Amino acid sequence: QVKDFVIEPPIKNNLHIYKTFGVFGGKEYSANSMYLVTKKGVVLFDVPWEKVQYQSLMDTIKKRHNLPVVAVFATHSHDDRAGDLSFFNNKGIKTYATAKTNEFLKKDGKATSTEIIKTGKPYRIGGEEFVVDFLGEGHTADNVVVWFPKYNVLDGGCLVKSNSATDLGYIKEANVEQWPKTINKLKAKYSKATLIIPGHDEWKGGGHVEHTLELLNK
């Protein structure tokens, strides 16, 4: 498979945004994920959209950083997020999801995580720190965000729409009534965030939170 994924220039050395692509309904779409380099290996936040690219990403990370992937955190149950966790489980790489996300994975016939996320509590690995937060339902009932306090970056995931999105996208499993309330909680909580990464489309340019509220109103 062609290496068409994009690893962006990192925030303060170790925090990386990476973009992967998938074709759905005759059109190519982008998903933004992240990874964090630590002294004990690399932590993925969500996985390539296409499972055929899992090994490719791991190989690229090994060549770039001389480090293995040592943990995978899913920000919800969908294919562009948790994906197929069996790939990582089979290799003995710890995978992390909330109880809710695991319930969805199991219901959908998919592999579940080997570790259970405690929301709102610091995770520390290889000298790095982050917090996985559940702010409420939105894009899905299980969507969570990831705060990186040393980087002032919030991984919004698919709860946050891109400034470049023209609709809400896949909403069959969304809680549209709760979504703006969850976004307003996010907006109030992460004032220190100088960068918020939306799950899909353009991550550059800011104004993602405000545009999410606009799309919800429309």
Positions touching Zn ion (CB under 5 A) are: 78, 80, 158, 199
Outline where 18-151 has alpha helix (H).
54-65, 86-90, 99-107
Smallest gap, in angstroms, from Cβ of residue 12 to Zn ion? 26
Shortest Cβ distance from residue 139 to Zn ion (Å)?
5
**Chain position carrying tokens 């933004």:** 32
Q: Which is nearer to Zn ion, 16 or 81 (CB)?
A: 81
CB closer to Zn ion, 78 vs 208: 78
What is the nearest approach in angstroms of Zn ion to the Cβ of residue 205? Answer: 19
Shortest spacing between CB 39 and Zn ion, in angstroms: 30
Q: Which is nearer to Zn ion, 10 or 169 (CB)?
A: 169
Taking the least distance from each CB to Zn ion, the nearer of 50 and 80 is 80
